[PDB]
Design a protein around this ligand. Structure first.
Ligand SMILES: CCCCCCCCCCCCCCCC(=O)O[C@H](CCCCCCCCCCC)CC(=O)N[C@H]1[C@@H](OP(=O)(O)O)O[C@H](CO[C@@H]2O[C@H](CO)[C@@H](OP(=O)(O)O)[C@H](OC(=O)C[C@@H](CCCCCCCCCCC)OC(=O)CCCCCCCCCCCCC)[C@H]2NC(=O)C[C@@H](CCCCCCCCCCC)OC(=O)CCCCCCCCCCC)[C@@H](O)[C@@H]1OC(=O)C[C@H](O)CCCCCCCCCCC
Ligand SMILES: O=C(O)[C@H]1C[C@@H](O)[C@@H](O)[C@@H]([C@H](O)CO)O1
Lengths: 58, 58
């Protein structure tokens, strides 16, 4: 060890960060009167309805 | 008019010319939202700053 033959110095680093996300929301707060389309074998009713409103410009 | 008219019924419209009152009170509101994100970060390092005499080769 007379010289710096044994003198040693070293550093090392490794950092990793990963992220991920997702969202999906929906809301509906109306009331619509529909009409029966047909009666199924079990008695369930197929209902279809439509409502058109022309407030102004569309 | 010679038609029959009930006494105790609510006088609902029954024929072509009958008139009815409609209260609109319409209120519809629908909303929809969605989001997504993805972040990846990495950063690596390595350094001696001092190398032993026996390791100077590499
Ligand atoms: C998943 C695991 C799978 C297994 C993987 C296997 C290993 C997968 C491979 C890992 C090793 C990387 C290979 C690097 C060399 C190489 O091939 O790929 C190079 C390109 C890179 C591609 C790599 C992509 C991989 C892709 C990734 C793949 C990963 C999988 C090409 C090249 O060759 N470029 C080359 C060129 O550049 P240029 O182009 O510009 O011309 O020339 C210049 C100048 O040459 C120098 O000149 C000096 C004087 O000037 C002279 O010194 P002097 O004494 O004479 O004065 C000096 O001589 C000397 O070292 C003198 C002497 C030093 C002895 C000191 C004691 C050290 C002991 C150290 C002990 C090591 C302990 C592990 O030697 C040696 O005995 C070396 C030790 C051999 C150990 C054998 C392992 C036994 C198992 C021991 C097992 C231990 C059990 C516990 C001269 N050095 C040379 O020639 C170069 C070479 C000479 C080869 C002849 C020796 C016998 C080889 C014999 C066989 C080797 C075969 C592999 O040595 C090496 O490093 C070889 C390292 C091998 C380690 C493998 C471990 C296997 C584990 C086994 C595991 C299964 C070089 O700088 C440059 O190389 C360099 O920079 C390299 C740099 O230094 C060192 C950085 C290392 C950091 C880690 C990598 C980090 C990289 C990470 C990012 C990708
Ligand atoms: O005993 C040896 O082998 C040495 C001692 C140091 O001086 C070393 O560095 C080397 C030098 O390179 C000679 O010129 O000689």
């Amino acid at each position: 060890f007379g010289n710096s033959r044994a003198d040693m110095e070293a550093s090392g680093g490794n950092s990793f960060n990963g992220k991920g996300g997702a969202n999906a929301s929906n809301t509906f707060s109306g009331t619509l009167t529909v009409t029966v389309d047909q009666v199924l074998a079990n008695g369930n009713l197929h209902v279809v309805g439509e409502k058109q409103i022309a407030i102004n410009q569309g | 008019n010679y038609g029959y008219q009930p006494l105790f019924e609510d006088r609902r419209p029954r024929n072509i010319g009958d008139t009815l009152t409609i209260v609109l009170q319409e209120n519809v509101s629908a909303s929809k939202s969605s989001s997504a994100n993805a972040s990846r970060d990495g950063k690596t390092s390595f350094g001696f700053d001092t190398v032993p005499r026996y390791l100077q080769g590499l």
